[PDB]
Amino acid sequence: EKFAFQAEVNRMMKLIINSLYKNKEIFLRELISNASDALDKIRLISLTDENALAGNEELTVKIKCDKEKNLLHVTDTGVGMTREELVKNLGTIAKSGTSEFLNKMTEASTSELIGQFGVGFYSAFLVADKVIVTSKHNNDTQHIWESDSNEFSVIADPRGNTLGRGTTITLVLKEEASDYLELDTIKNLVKKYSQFINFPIYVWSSKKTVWDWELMN
Ligand SMILES: COC(=O)c1c(O)cc(O)c(Cl)c1CCc1nccn1Cc1ccc(Cl)o1
């Protein structure tokens, strides 16, 4: 249940890190944008079958900081991923045109190259020592994908179905990336990266203080 990344994905990872170490916050743009895509897919699926929305009726992105645990969570109620999809889409295969989307990277700002080829997930390793993807798809049981980028593993989630339908990306942050645990930093970055997203985006925030979802767009 442990897997080597494919070679071009290794190169893509290294390329994305060396390109973007200057602009780490880009990871958040990409995760938000990828969450939006997932929501789009399940909304499209719901056109012809709205049993599609049964496990979870809402279409949202919900972002949560755990400063004490050094975690950042990005959760969408999109289409989710099957176990098989986690293995194929997140490492073992590359999309057509990968086998050098990589020239264009080097040659001829890679900020939009990544967003354009839909490969921004890997910018998560800019700010994170570990990335965990917990995902629930209508056609499968909830699974966990985990990676420090030197391999990955996929397991059935022992907790069962807690997402309903969708995906959480959990980042174990690097020391270099500790500012991304701060609420005002994340809020200000989610506001900026979500103004053109059509799904509502929440940050778990504080306001006798109480916590709750704060809408960011
Ligand atoms: C179906 O996508 C997702 O459930 C999802 C999500 O909800 C939030 C996210 O931040 C990300 Cl990264 C994802 C997955 C992104 C993705 N889905 C299929 C492929 N990929 C990324 C990818 C890059 C190269 C190849 Cl092959 O696949």
Q: How far apart (Å, rounded) are the C-alpha atoms in residues 89 and 95?
A: 8
Strands 2-3 and 61-66: unpaired
Q: How far apart (Å, rounded) are the C-alpha atoms in residues 28 and 191?
A: 11
**How far does the centroid of ligand 1 lie from the alpha carbon of residue 210, in Å?**
33
Residue-range domain boundaries for the chain: 1-217
34 is in an annotated binding site: yes
Write down the residue that tokens 């099957």 correspond to: 82
| β strands within 106-149, DSSP E | 128-136, 143-147
**How far does the centroid of ligand 1 lie from the alpha carbon of residue 209, in Å?**
36
- Structural class in CATH, domain 1-217: alpha beta
76 is in an annotated binding site: yes
Helices (H), the chain: 7-20, 26-48, 83-87, 101-106, 111-117, 183-193
**Neighbour count for residue 191 (Cβ, 10 Å):** 13
Strands of 128-136's sheet, edge to edge?
A: 2-3, 152-156, 143-147, 128-136, 166-173, 71-76, 61-66, 201-206, 211-215
Pick from 193, 194, 216: nearest CA to 204: 216
| Residue 82: strand, helix, or coil | coil
Residue closest via CA to ligand 1's atom 6 equals: 35
Contact 62, 72 (CB under 8 A): no
Q: How far apart (Å, rounded) are the C-alpha atoms in residues 95 and 181?
A: 32
Q: What's the reported resolution, in angstroms, to a tenth?
A: 2.6
Residue closest via CA to ligand 1's atom 10 equals: 31
**How far does the centroid of ligand 1 lie from the alpha carbon of residue 114, in Å?**
13
Contact 203, 213 (CB under 8 A): yes
Q: How far apart (Å, rounded) are the C-alpha atoms in residues 75 and 60?
A: 8
| Residue 56: strand, helix, or coil | coil
Q: How far apart (Å, rounded) are the C-alpha atoms in residues 57 and 165?
A: 9
